[PDB]
Amino acid sequence: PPAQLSVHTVSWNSGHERVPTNLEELLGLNSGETPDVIAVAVQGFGFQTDKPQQGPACVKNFQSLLTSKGYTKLKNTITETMGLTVYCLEKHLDQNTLKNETIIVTVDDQKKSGGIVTSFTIYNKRFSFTTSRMSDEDVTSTNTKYAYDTRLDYSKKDDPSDFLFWIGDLNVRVETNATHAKSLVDQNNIDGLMAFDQLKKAKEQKLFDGWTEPQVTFKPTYKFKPNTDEYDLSATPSWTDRALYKSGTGKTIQPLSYNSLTNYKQTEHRPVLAKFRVTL
Numbered sequence: 001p002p003a004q005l006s007v008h009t010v011s012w013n014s015g016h017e018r019v020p021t022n023l024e025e026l027l028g029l030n031s032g033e034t035p036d037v038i039a040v041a042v043q044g045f046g047f048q049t050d051k052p053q054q055g056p057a058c059v060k061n062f063q064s065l066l067t068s069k070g071y072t073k074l075k076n077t078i079t080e081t082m083g084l085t086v087y088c089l090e091k092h093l094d095q096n097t098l099k100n101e102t103i104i105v106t107v108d109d110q111k112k113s114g115g116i117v118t119s120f121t122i123y124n125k126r127f128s129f130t131t132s133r134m135s136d137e138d139v140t141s142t143n144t145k146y147a148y149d150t151r152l153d154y155s156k157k158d159d160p161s162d163f164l165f166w167i168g169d170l171n172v173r174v175e176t177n178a179t180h181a182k183s184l185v186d187q188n189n190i191d192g193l194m195a196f197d198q199l200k201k202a203k204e205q206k207l208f209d210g211w212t213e214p215q216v217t218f219k220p221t222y223k224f225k226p227n228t229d230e231y232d233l234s235a236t237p238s239w240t241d242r243a244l245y246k247s248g249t250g251k252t253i254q255p256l257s258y259n260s261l262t263n264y265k266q267t268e269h270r271p272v273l274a275k276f277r278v279t280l
């Protein structure tokens with residue numbers, strides 16, 4: 001059992017986008033890094049029914065990439081609007097203690113909103129990865145629009161998880177007009193634009209309680225004109241894909257890196273990659 005392990009998370013509100021070409025860049029592997037755990041989350045349209053017959057390409061692309069690197073896919077789960085895959089280096093895995101388990105929680109009759117939680121145990125320490133999806137119009141357990149539900153929060157449990165990450169588009173946005181928001185972006189005033197971000201409001205309403213976001217240094221990841229770097233000012237530029245972290249048992253988690261991946265310009269949102277170090 002090592003003292004520390006590293007985790008990479010990536011999420012993307014990808015819509016109808018297929019898997020892109022350079023996957024090492026997407027998962028933060030393009031500089032020789034060997035993370036112990038990798039988690040990939042999507043939000044979009046039509047995953048489960050797979051009309052585009054895309055799912056077999058996803059498999060081939062992610063197996064080509066990760067099998068030789070020593071990773072085992074612990075779980076892939078898709079719904080019509082969400083996707084969550086967790087990988088872990090094979091060497092850390094004990095079949096007798098893994099206790100690999102996934103839940104899906106949907107809140108609407110159409111099964112478009114709610115979340116996925118995948119959890120697993122290595123070195124007697126339990127990880128949970130959550131992704132979630134909420135739409136503005138939804139009727140919710142919190143009476144807010146935010147993609148939080150206590151059933152997706154494995155810190156609120158009597159045998160809580162050791163290491164938890166929540167990744168995906170939290171339906172948290174910037175609460176100011178677009179004109180002002182674009183002007184703060186042009187001034188590189190990231191912190192001044194962040195003052196209007198809703199995550200702090202959600203936390204006031206006791207949502208995402210005790211969950212932490214790494215310092216944000218990058219410009220809003222949404223809403224872009226596809227295949228350009230131009231904001232479509234029909235929405236207030238915002239931070240849609242986020243990465244949050246927490247321990248349910250007092251463990252130390254340290255963010256190493258948190259960044260948008262602006263080379264992936266194909267749709268209205270940009271992917272977000274985070275890298276962490278956890279102490280067992």
Ligand code: HEM
Nearest residue numbers: 014016017018019046047050052054055058059062076085
């Ligand atoms: C940027 C876009 C996307 C990413 C990052 C993504 C990623 C993934 C990942 C990581 C898996 C698990 C791979 C593995 O077996 O190791 C997967 C599986 C899947 N993907 Fe995607 N994908 C995307 C787009 C799509 C789209 C657009 C569709 C359909 C409209 C789709 C349908 C599926 C299906 C059905 C599976 C299940 C595959 C199976 O187990 O046979 N994917 N994808």
